[PDB]
Amino acid sequence: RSSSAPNVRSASEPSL
């Protein structure tokens, strides 16, 4: 594919 232009606290229970 091509490239194009640029712009201008708790430990919770994780998912599977």
Partner 1 sequence: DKNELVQKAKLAEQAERYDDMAACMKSVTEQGAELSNEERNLLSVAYKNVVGARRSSWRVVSSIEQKTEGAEKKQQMAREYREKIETELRDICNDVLSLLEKFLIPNASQAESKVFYLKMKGDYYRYLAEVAAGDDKKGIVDQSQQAYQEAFEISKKEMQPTHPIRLGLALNFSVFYYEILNSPEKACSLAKTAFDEAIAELDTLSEESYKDSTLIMQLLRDNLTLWTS
Distance CA 16, CA 12 (A): 13
Shortest Å distance, C-beta 6 to partner 1? 6
- The pair of structure tokens assigned to 8 is 């201008």
Instruction: Return the residues preceding each gap in the chain, C–N over 2.5 A, or none.
Output: 8
Shortest Å distance, C-beta 10 to partner 1? 5
Shortest Å distance, C-beta 9 to partner 1? 8
Tell me which residues in 1-16 interact with partner 1 (CB under 8 A): 2-8, 10-16
| List of residues contacting partner 1 (CB under 8 A) | 2-8, 10-16
